Design a protein around this nucleic acid. Sequence first.
RNA 1: UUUAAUCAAAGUUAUUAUUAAAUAAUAUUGAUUUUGGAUGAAUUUAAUUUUUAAUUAUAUU
Length: 41
Amino acid sequence: ETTPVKYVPEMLNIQNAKWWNGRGKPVYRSTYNEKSWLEKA
RNA sequence: UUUAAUCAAAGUUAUUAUUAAAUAAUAUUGAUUUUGGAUGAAUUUAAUUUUUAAUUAUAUU
């Protein structure tokens, strides 16, 4: 394995929302993002 | 008994029900019976990305 995985299929903003297609978060995202992205905005 | 043959359909019916849908801010380890069963790895889902987290303006770039 030169590179483990190049061009990961997440780079396309695949909408994997738990209420939309049934898949939860991708494993790379943390399961508990304490504060949403609005509170950091 | 004779019908020469034909020609019409208009306007009322029993005996029993309380379910759906939206709304309400006070629950929560998966809905459909008794694990493993050797006493052990079966029943493990974790990682800084608009995520069951959902954003009071018409300007500038």
